[PDB]
Amino acid sequence: FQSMSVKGRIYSILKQIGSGGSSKVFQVLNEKKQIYAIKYVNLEEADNQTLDSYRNEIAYLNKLQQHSDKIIRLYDYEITDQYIYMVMECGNIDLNSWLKKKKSIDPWERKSYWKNMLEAVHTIHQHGIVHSDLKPANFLIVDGMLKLIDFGIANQGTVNYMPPEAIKDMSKISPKSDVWSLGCILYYMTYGKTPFQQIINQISKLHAIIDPNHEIEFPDIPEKDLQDVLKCCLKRDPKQRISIPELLAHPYVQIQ
Question: What counts of helices (H) and strands (E) characterise the chain?
Answer without folding.
Answer: 9, 9
